[PDB]
A paper describes a structure:
Polysaccharide co-polymerases are a large family of membrane proteins that play an essential role in regulating the length distribution of the synthesized polysaccharide chain by interacting with the membrane-bound polymerase Wzy as it assembles the growing Oag or ECA polysaccharide of the LPS. Key to the Wzy-dependent pathway is the polysaccharide co-polymerase [name] that is known to homo-oligomerize into a unique bell-shaped structure. As well as being assembled into bell-shaped structures common features include a membrane topology consisting of an N (TM1) and C (TM2) terminal transmembrane helix, an elongated periplasmic α-helical domain containing a predicted coiled-coil region and conserved sequence motifs such as a Proline-rich segment proximal to TM2 and a glycine-rich segment within TM2. With that in mind, we determined and herby report the structure of a fully intact example polysaccharide co-polymerase, [name], from [name] by cryo-electron microscopy to an overall resolution of 3.0 Å.
Since an octameric complex is clearly visible in the unsymmetrized map, 8-fold (C8) symmetry was applied which led to a marked improvement in overall resolution to 3.0 Å. The high quality of the map allowed ~95% of the amino acid sequence to be unambiguously built, revealing structural details of the transmembrane and cytoplasmic domains as well as a highly conserved proline-rich segment proximal to the C-terminal transmembrane helix. Herein, the loop is positioned on the inside of the cavity and extends to the center of the periplasmic domain in a similar conformation as seen in the structure of a Salmonella typhimurium/Shigella flexneri [name] chimera. While the first two prolines of this motif are seen in the trans conformation, P293 is best modeled in the cis-conformation in the density of our structure. The cis-conformation of the ω torsion angle of proline 293 creates a unique kink in this linker region thus helping to direct the C-terminal transmembrane helix into position. In the octameric assembly, the 2-helix bundles are ~32 Å apart (when measured from center to center) and do not interact with one another. Within each bundle their closest interactions are at their cross-point, which perhaps not surprisingly, coincides with the conserved GXXXG motif that has been found in ~50% of all α-helical membrane proteins and is suggested to be involved in helix-helix packing. Each of the pillars is tilted slightly inward toward the center of the chamber, reducing the inner diameter from ~75 Å on the periplasmic side to ~64 Å on the cytoplasmic side and the outer diameter from ~100 Å on the periplasmic side to ~83 Å on the cytoplasmic side. However, at the N-terminal end of the protein, a short amphipathic helix (α0) runs parallel to the membrane and interacts with TM2 of its helix bundle as well as with TM2 of the neighboring protomer, which curves slightly toward α0.
Author numbering:
A (entry chain A): 99 to 293
B (entry chain B): 196 to 244
C (entry chain H): 245 to 293
């Protein structure tokens, strides 16, 4: 705001008749509160003109941010719909290895003659070596029904899937941006400055 | 999880596991060892979906 | 010789980091090194003489 209000201050000196309009910090040490001003020709006509020029810069900043957020959200859900496609092909390179681990464990369970499952339980996922204890019959169905076996997804996938539904749900039209706050409404003066 | 159960009914239909063979599980049951719950107990996890 | 290798979860991180570096496109990527807060004016009062 303070750089777009001082950029309105320099396009009002390019009028045929100049209109002075300034902006400055209030006390000479800290940055804000800022102190805008304007000189006119009447008491009423220099307060109406200042409250118009505050709303003119405010409607330029507020439209340069709803336009900026729409180019950030519609591009932010493109780097997430891509990051769910490259994270799914990794999740099928793990599935194509799990079918290959099962396809080797059918050869171990065909020589050791394990047909019915000998596993009573497993407290974790079954590794490569102890995979043949599921049986010769139950491992022949994990290869026959291979293309319909569902993928498994890491908990980082469901984090960036929930991060895409959060970026698709927020709305910028009803979102209100305000770049400034009145601590003093624009006054109308009693004593003129000249003559 | 319904799709993991729906595939594990096909494994437990060929291996002929009807009654549950699991005595316990110290964690959640994964995709591979899900067919040990049985053919009968996995037909009710799909009917009551 | 047909027994499959097992890969650490740092391998599948840097495998997913290669598919992310092969998928991004620089032709449709727009870079802007500046932003107008004031369009270039045309002056009314000259400077000299």
């Amino acid at each position: 705001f303070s750089s777009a209000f001082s950029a309105l201050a320099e396009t009002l000196d390019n009028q045929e008749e100049r209109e002075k309009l300034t902006i400055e910090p209030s006390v000479k040490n800290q940055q804000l509160p800022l102190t805008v001003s304007y000189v006119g020709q009447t008491a009423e006509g220099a307060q109406m003109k200042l409250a118009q020029y505050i709303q003119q810069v405010d409607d330029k900043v507020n439209q340069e941010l709803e336009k900026d957020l729409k180019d950030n959200i519609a591009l932010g859900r493109k780097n997430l719909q891509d990051s769910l496609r490259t994270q799914e092909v990794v999740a099928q390179e793990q599935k194509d290895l799990r079918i290959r681990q099962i396809q080797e464990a059918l050869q171990y369970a065909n020589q050791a003659q394990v047909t019915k499952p000998q596993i009573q339980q497993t407290g974790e996922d079954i590794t490569q070596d102890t995979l043949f204890l599921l049986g010769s019959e139950a491992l022949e169905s994990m290869i026959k029904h291979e293309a319909t076996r569902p993928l498994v997804f890491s908990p980082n996938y469901y984090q960036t899937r929930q991060n895409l539904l959060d970026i698709e749900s927020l709305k910028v039209d009803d979102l209100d941006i305000h770049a400034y706050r009145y601590v003093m409404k624009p006054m109308l003066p009693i004593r003129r400055d000249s003559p």
